[PDB]
Design a binder for this molecule. Structure first.
Ligand SMILES: *C[C@@](*)(O)[C@H](CCCNC(N)=[NH2+])NC(=O)CNC(=O)[C@@H](N)CCC(=O)O
Ligand SMILES: [Ca+2]
Lengths: 235, 223, 54, 214
């Protein structure tokens, strides 16, 4: 996260980090105690992934941490079925043992297709993660967060030569300087609705980070919520 | 320097076909969507077709897609338009155009070529005759002296007229051609100079008509 | 009077239109419809999407 | 499908004036509006994008404003080289509807034409046709009357006119008139005359020549 602020412990209890041979390569969100949602381009790699929830400062072992092995990876079935790199950029992780929900480890809410999109069109979301705090710079130690406005489709499409699918949306600032970045991928874009946070996107991609005239690109979760509910349903 | 050089246009009989090409340089070709915009008699501009950097996004104006096909070849920095089964109303100047800024397919255009002229007509090519325009006598009362070239009975447009291979440009007027009752075009290009300077130069008009592969260099004198 | 197309039917979370042009509210999993029938209250110790060091 | 209606369609104004061209969209296009300048014999030139931002190399006297359905291009202090047709372009839709264009002409002081007559060439006479050309040079305004006379006899249906575009420096016009004749009917007469009427001339001006002497 470029240009954000230090979060407080417990401020984003649905945020998890993905660790592999390299630590903290991506982010994710707690769906329930056995399931994480993230971006497919983070996890369709064959890397053996450990998930850590309740995390705040990734340099120190903190007593709130809960570490779990990933036992299954489900990229959305359309992700591997196409050449385009970021269309359908979403994936589910099943965990070896259930999380223990508490103040630092809490799921994110997920509305149905209609209402996830309504909340998104409120136009203000939060992103968080431990990715780079400058384009090609150093990564964060303390969890970062950032309020980002929704960018309308016409503006988004005209900001890039690249194809922006209906399964993507834009968020960021006209003047630049504030954006998600490499390493934040798979983390949540959430909308607060009377103090209840709902998942509205997945951090997916962009052309560089925080460049003026460019915006961050997010997977549109509303298009996938019916799929999420089915795959993560507990018994 | 941004360059967009269109070619392949010209005169064609109804029902036959043409392939327009535009070769590009002076920018990163594959960072930009590219487009064809035509200017039809009256001087309306009309977007015809466009294509995204990768060739997977694009579109067409009404009533052309069954006959027109846009494509691009990023290795040759070229854009193409296949035009089949041509009709009279396709006659226009076809410009190659580049999306501004992000290179988005949905942007407006910042760079334009010079255009290739497409003419759909039954009439056959005919090269021009170039005749001198030289006054019979010269009046002391006129502060300027005039001479010219009459470029007569050709088809199709255009002819380009220059004087002394482009050295002489001040005081030159090349008039728009008029269509004669024969269906051939005529024009004249004239130059005027201060009367006393007349003898300090030679005056040669260079007329070029690519459709007939005609090139003429006429020296104009008094007689 | 009160429909879902104005202000979400005054519901804190979800709204569905019922008969006689008035609304029924609902809450996402882990929440209970509050006694005022507009607001939502927790039905679990750690309901989704809430900060609760509070 | 979005309509773009530009007005006025033709305009005449003096150097240093302020001129405003408006463009109306049949439905809202936000700020996705561009302005082009097209000078005679040249390709259109990108002036303004996103309704109000200037492309590099477009003078600061050009200004754009507006959003939704009402837009304007403003020229602060108009110059002789600003003679052109200006077009708006909506790019909210992929169809990219252009405006009809506004032709802007420059007013200047009256200037009388210089008049010249050219006889048919010998080489053209061999082909069987004779063209006699009369030139009206560097005048304003554009309105003028040209009448041909052969042995004091007014001609009709025999001649074709052509006009230049307004000149980008001195804002004047030039005109040609071409009299076309059979080689046969050319030699049935002696005196060929061009008579010119223009508000810069007090009385009409005639330039003639005699066949045979030329
Ligand atoms: C996979 C995930 O961690 C990253 C995050 C990118 C988000 N960027 C912005 N501005 N929100 N996803 C990617 O890196 C996807 N690839 C790209 O964006 C490429 N343009 C270059 C990748 C790079 O800069 O390293
Ligand atoms: Ca820690």
């Amino acid at each position: 996260v470029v240009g954000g602020e230090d979060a407080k412990p417990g401020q984003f209890p649905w945020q998890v980090v993905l660790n592999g041979k390299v630590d903290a390569f991506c982010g994710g969100s707690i769906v329930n105690e056995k399931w994480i949602v993230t971006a497919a381009h983070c996890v369709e790699t064959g890397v053996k992934i450990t998930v850590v929830a309740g995390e705040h400062n990734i340099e120190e072992t903190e007593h709130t941490e809960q570490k779990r092995n990933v036992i299954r990876i489900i990229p959305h079935h359309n992700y591997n079925a196409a050449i385009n790199k970021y269309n359908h950029d979403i994936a589910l992780l099943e965990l070896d043992e259930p999380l223990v929900l508490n103040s630092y480890v809490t799921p994110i809410c997920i509305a149905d297709k209609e209402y996830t999109n309504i909340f998104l069109k409120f136009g203000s979301g939060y992103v968080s993660g431990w990715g780079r705090v400058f384009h090609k710079g150093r990564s964060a130690l303390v969890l970062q967060y950032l309020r980002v406005p929704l960018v309308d489709r016409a503006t988004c499409l005209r900001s890039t030569k690249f194809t922006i699918y209906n399964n993507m949306f834009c968020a960021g600032f006209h003047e630049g300087g504030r954006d998600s970045c490499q390493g934040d991928s798979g983390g949540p874009h959430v909308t607060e609705v009377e103090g209840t946070s709902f998942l509205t996107g997945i951090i997916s991609w962009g052309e560089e980070c925080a460049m003026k005239g460019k915006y961050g690109i997010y997977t549109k979760v509303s298009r996938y919520v019916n799929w999420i509910k089915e795959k993560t349903k507990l018994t | 320097e941004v360059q967009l050089v269109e070619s392949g246009g010209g005169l064609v009989q109804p029902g036959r076909s043409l392939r327009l090409s535009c070769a590009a340089s002076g920018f990163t070709f594959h960072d930009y969507a590219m487009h064809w915009v035509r200017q039809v008699p009256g001087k309306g501009l009309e977007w015809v077709s466009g294509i995204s950097w990768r060739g997977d996004i694009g579109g067409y104006v009404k009533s052309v897609k069954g006959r027109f096909t846009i494509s691009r070849d990023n290795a040759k920095n070229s854009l193409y338009l296949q035009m089949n089964s041509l009709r009279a109303e396709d006659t226009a100047l076809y410009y190659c155009v580049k999306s501004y800024g992000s290179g988005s397919f949905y942007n407006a255009f910042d760079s334009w070529g010079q255009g290739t002229l497409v003419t759909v007509s039954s009439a056959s090519t005919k090269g021009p005759s170039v005749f001198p325009l030289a006054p019979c006598s010269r009046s002391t009362s006129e502060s300027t002296a005039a001479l010219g070239c009459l470029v007569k009975d050709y088809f199709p447009e255009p002819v380009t007229v220059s004087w002394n291979s482009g050295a002489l440009t001040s005081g030159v007027h090349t008039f728009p051609a008029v269509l004669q009752s024969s269906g051939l075009y005529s024009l004249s290009s004239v130059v005027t100079v201060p009367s006393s300077s007349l003898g300090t130069k030679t005056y040669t008009c260079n007329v070029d008509h690519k459709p007939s592969n005609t090139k003429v260099d006429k020296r104009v004198e008094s007689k | 009077d009160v429909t879902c197309n104005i202000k979400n039917g005054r519901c804190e979370q979800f709204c569905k239109n019922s008969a006689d042009n008035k609304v029924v509210c609902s809450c996402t999993e882990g929440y209970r419809l509050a006694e005022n029938q507009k607001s939502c209250e927790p039905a679990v110790p750690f309901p989704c999407g809430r900060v609760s060091v509070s | 499908d979005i309509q773009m209606t530009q007005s006025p369609s033709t305009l005449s104004a003096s150097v240093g004036d302020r001129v405003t061209i408006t463009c109306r969209a049949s439905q809202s296009i936000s700020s996705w509006l561009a302005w082009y300048q097209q000078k005679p014999g040249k390709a259109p030139k990108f002036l303004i994008y996103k309704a109000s931002k200037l492309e590099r190399g477009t003078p600061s006297r050009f200004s754009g404003s507006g959003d939704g359905t009402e837009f304007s291009l403003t020229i602060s202090s108009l110059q002789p080289d600003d003679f052109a047709t200006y077009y708006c372009l909506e790019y909210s839709s992929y169809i990219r509807t252009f405006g009809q264009g506004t032709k802007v002409e420059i007013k200047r002081t009256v200037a009388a034409p210089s008049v010249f007559i050219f006889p048919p060439s010998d080489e053209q006479l061999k082909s069987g046709t004779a063209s006699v050309v009369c030139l009206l040079n560097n005048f304003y305004p554009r309105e003028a009357k040209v009448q041909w006379k052969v042995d004091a006899a007014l001609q009709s249906g025999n001649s074709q006119e052509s006009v230049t575009e307004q000149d980008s420096k001195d804002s004047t016009y030039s005109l040609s008139s071409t009299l076309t004749l059979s080689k046969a009917d050319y030699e049935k007469h002696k005196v060929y005359a061009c008579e010119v009427t223009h508000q810069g001339l007090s009385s009409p001006v005639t330039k003639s020549f005699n066949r045979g002497e030329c």
